[PDB]
Amino acid sequence: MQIFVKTLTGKTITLEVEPSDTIENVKAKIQDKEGIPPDQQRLIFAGKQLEDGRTLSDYNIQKESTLHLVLRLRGG
Ligand SMILES: [Zn+2]
Ligand SMILES: [Zn+2]
Ligand SMILES: [Zn+2]
């Protein structure tokens, strides 16, 4: 299925995923796509911050949901 990701910048890249994909997997889908280390990504859905461990369905995300991307960076 498909969902979107809106970086703060306003940029909106869009991902193919599975309802039972871990967040870890998204973060991974982004690294191999924007080369941003998962361990620097943090992801938010409807104001909730999501956990490396739980799946999309856990958070009730569905086709064409927008997640916003924010970075943690304590390396610069
Ligand atoms: Zn998957
Ligand atoms: Zn990859
Ligand atoms: Zn939003």
What residues contact residue 35 under an 8 Å CB cut-off, 6+ apart? Answer: none
Judged by its nearest atom, the ligand closest to the C-alpha of residue 44 is 3
Backbone angles phi, psi at 37, to 5 degrees: -50, 130
Give kind and range of the element (H or E) at residue 25.
helix 23-34
Cα dihedral 26, 30, 35, 37 sign: negative
In degrees, rounded to 5, the angle at the alpha carbon of residue 42 between the alpha carbons of residues 68 and 55 is 85
Distance (Å, whole) CA 1 – CA 10? 22
Distance (Å, whole) CA 49 – CA 27? 13
Q: How far is the CA of 51 from the centre of ligand 2 (A)?
A: 19
Token pair 């943090």: residue: 42
Please report, for the chain, how many H helices and E strands are present, in that order.
1, 5
Q: How far is the CA of 47 from the centre of ligand 3 (A)?
A: 8
Q: How far is the CA of 22 from the centre of ligand 1 (A)?
A: 8
Following CA atoms 31, 36, 40, 46 in sequence, which dihedral angle do they give, to the nearest 10 degrees?
-70
Domains and CATH numbers, the chain: 1-76 (3.10.20.90)
